[PDB]
A paper describes a structure:
During the initial stages of the campaign, we identified that a chloride substituent located between N6 and N4 fits into the small pocket forming a halogen-hydrogen bond donor interaction with the side chain hydroxyl of Ser362 (C–Cl···H angle = 76°; Cl···O distance = 3.8 Å), which substantially improves the binding affinity. However, the adenine aromatic core cannot form a conventional hydrogen bond with Asp476, unlike pyrazolopyrimidine 1 moiety. Therefore, we decided to merge the two structural features and synthesize 5-chloropyrazolopyrimidine fragment. This compound exhibited improved potency together with ligand efficiency (IC50 = 2 μM, LE = 0.60) and submicromolar equilibrium dissociation constant (KD = 146 nM) measured by isothermal titration calorimetry (ITC). During the initial stages of the campaign focused on fragment optimization, we successfully developed a synthetic route to prepare compound 3. To synthesize chloropyrazolopyrimidine heterocycle 3, first, we performed a cyclization reaction of 41 by heating it in the presence of urea forming a condensed ring. The following deoxygenation and chlorination of the pyrimidine ring was achieved by POCl3. Finally, we carried out regioselective SNAr using an ethanolic solution of MeNH2 (33%), yielding the desired fragment 3 with an overall yield of 9%.
Residue numbers in the entry: 344 to 507
The structure:
């Protein structure tokens, strides 16, 4: 069912995460972690303190899809482990230094064609698939986007609700 999902999304904040490769989204699903550039790390740390739930909605660049979404379970922390991120051009391990802990709510894909009807007021009402890494998605757009994903029956939202 969708009732516990809707409870988790209640009053959440939503952020578009753009990853330059699949390997790091795969690593994030396996390890329950995410790292981003400092400008976005600052925004997510602020949001984490301000909202009952901060949801990261993931999209690998050029995949034409979202790869799932997750809830921040911590602010960023340094020095816990050297997450073997696969680094593309220009990006280095010091920039991706802060690690957030995340609980996955859905590890299933959603193609961009399925969200064509959702626009993001905080990005000039462009289609929600359009946005830079770290772009905030307004509550109603973000809620409807998350509800479009296929249910992920491997995930029990009970423990997530307790983190709140
Ligand atoms: C592990 N975090 C990340 N990994 C890769 Cl390949 N790209 C990005 C971007 C564009 N923001 N955060 C990223």
């Amino acid at each position: 069912g969708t009732s516990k999902l809707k409870y988790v999304l209640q009053d959440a904040r939503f952020f578009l995460i753009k990853s330059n490769n699949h390997e790091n989204v795969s690593l994030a699903k396996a390890k329950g972690v995410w790292s981003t550039l400092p400008v976005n790390e600052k925004k997510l740390n602020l949001a984490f303190r301000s909202a009952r739930s901060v949801i990261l909605i993931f999209s690998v660049r050029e995949s034409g899809k979202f790869q799932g979404f997750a809830r921040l379970s911590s602010e960023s922390h340094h020095g816990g482990s050297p997450i073997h991120w696969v680094l593309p051009a220009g990006m280095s391990a010091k920039m991706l230094g802060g690690v957030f802990k995340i609980d996955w709510i859905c590890r299933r894909e959603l193609p961009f064609t399925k969200s064509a009807h959702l626009t993001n007021p905080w990005n000039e009402h462009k289609p929600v698939k359009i946005g830079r890494d770290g772009q905030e998605i307004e509550l109603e757009c973000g809620t409807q986007l998350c509800l479009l994903f296929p249910p992920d029956e491997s995930i029990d939202l009970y423990q997530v609700i307790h983190k709140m």
